[PDB]
Design a protein around this nucleic acid. Structure first.
Ligand code: SF4
Ligand SMILES: O=P([O-])(O)O
Ligand SMILES: O=P([O-])(O)O
Length: 219
DNA sequence: ATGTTGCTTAGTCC
DNA sequence: GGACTAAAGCAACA
């Protein structure tokens, strides 16, 4: 199917009962946004359809993409990620605002699970379910040469996608693994506030990941 | 009030 | 694998 069909069918998905419930349950729970409209639906990927680089996240944040409708938009993860994409020369501007004209150059963003999960922890069954969408979405990104897993969950999801053994591809920040056709699989700590604010993942470390991804992608 | 909540990782154990 | 938990620094939240 083409992208329009992908977006149409994805947004109507209701395969995971716990997530169909949670994504609406959190609406109005955060003071700063009470009374505002929430997307509260599956989150479609965003970016360059001709991207050579794919940043693969974990899932929608309750008041992040689950609220704005765009990956990494409206929360601490995006506050960290988007300015860095611009600093690396991969976007039109530093900030991402729903409904703006932000363009990503050579990069596309999505995640393992597309509906906000409780405690940011999807179940093994929910991951297997949404993996069907990963197949469809990555299938619509023919030019990707570098797949960047943001966090352990994301890496494992990508390993399943490529039919790779976990034992041979452990999760460690900076890990680099080869993929068929001269492609690459990179692993980085997730951009979560828990990782950046605690010093586990610094702005320097992530920009480096981005610069390495560009290098490996021929950009 | 100032204590609680919410935002992954790495190690443990079966 | 999968379930469980102590640990990390910050600030909205109550
Ligand atoms: S998480 Fe994925 S599979 Fe589950 S309901 Fe949402 S879009 Fe569908
Ligand atoms: O809502 P996310 O894309 O920042 O997880
Ligand atoms: O932000 P607070 O401290 O007025 O609740």
């Amino acid at each position: 199917m083409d992208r329009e069909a992908f977006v149409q069918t994805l947004t109507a998905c209701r395969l995971c009962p716990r997530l169909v419930a949670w994504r609406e349950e959190v609406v109005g729970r955060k003071r700063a946004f009470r009374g505002e409209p929430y997307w509260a639906r599956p989150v479609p990927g965003f970016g360059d359809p001709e991207a050579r680089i794919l940043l693969f996240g974990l899932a929608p944040g309750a008041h992040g993409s689950n609220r704005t409708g765009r990956p990494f938009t409206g929360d601490a993860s995006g506050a960290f990620l988007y300015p860095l994409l611009h600093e690396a020369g991969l976007s039109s501007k530093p900030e991402s605002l729903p409904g703006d004209d932000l363009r990503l150059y050579g990069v596309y963003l999505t995640a393992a699970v597309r509906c906000a999960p409780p405690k940011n922890k999807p179940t093994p069954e929910e991951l297997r379910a949404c993996a069907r969408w990963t197949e469809v979405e990555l299938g619509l990104l023919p030019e990707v040469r570098v797949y960047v897993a943001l966090g352990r969950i994301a890496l494992e999801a990508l390993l399943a996608h490529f039919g790779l053994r976990k034992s041979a591809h452990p999760f460690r920040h900076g890990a680099h693994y080869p993929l068929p056709g001269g492609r690459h699989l990179l692993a980085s700590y997730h951009v979560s506030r828990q990782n950046t604010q605690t010093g586990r993942l610094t702005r320097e470390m992530f920009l480096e990941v981005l610069m390495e991804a560009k290098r490996l992608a021929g950009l």
